[PDB]
Chains A and B, each alone.
With several copies, the nearest count.
Chain A
Amino acid sequence: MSQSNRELVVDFLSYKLSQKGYSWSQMAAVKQALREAGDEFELRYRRAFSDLTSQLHITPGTAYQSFEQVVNELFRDGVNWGRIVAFFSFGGALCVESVDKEMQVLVSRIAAWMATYLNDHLEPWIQENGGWDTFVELYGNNAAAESRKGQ
């Protein structure tokens, strides 16, 4: 037996049940909503200006500052859902740049930095503003994209 066969099935069923409206932990719902919100943010940014990863620049020694620098700049005025989505997309952009420049060792580090910032500085705001549950209700089912396409 291949555990990948189990993993593939479980992922599909989680995706499908959550998509059809059912929820319990809402883990699948949040993940899917983030994937969608991330795509929508990057689309809007790429149309407004250039692509996100186009202007990034880092080295293993200068990777961390360039991260905290941008992130703390993003949230100095405060926190909202849009910025949290942008936080994920920037982290993704940083990883794409790292791989493109063959500094793949930075990927798991960037991931750790994101998780740490999310945990230390974003989670308190999220819990006081309805938790991930509110994010799902607002941004689930590709809501941000549907708002744009309506116009």
Chain B
Amino acid sequence: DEMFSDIYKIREIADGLCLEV
């Protein structure tokens, strides 16, 4: 299963780009 599910969650939440830290 997706091991970086959290970063994809915040990407849809936001309108634009998110830091990948």
Contacts and interface: CB of A to CB of B under 8 A. Distances in A.
Contacts, number: 160
Contact of A81 (B8, B9, B19, B21): B19
Nearest to B11: A74
Main secondary structure of the interface of A (DSSP, over half): helix
Nearest to B15: A82
Interface in A80-114: 80-83, 85-86, 90, 99, 102, 104-108, 111-112
Contacts of B14: 41, 74, 80, 82-83, 85-86
A10 B14 CA distance: 14
15 contacts: A4-B2, A4-B3, A6-B21, A14-B20, A28-B21, A44-B17, A49-B9, A73-B11, A74-B10, A77-B11, A82-B13, A85-B14, A86-B17, A108-B16, A115-B19
Interface of B: 1-21
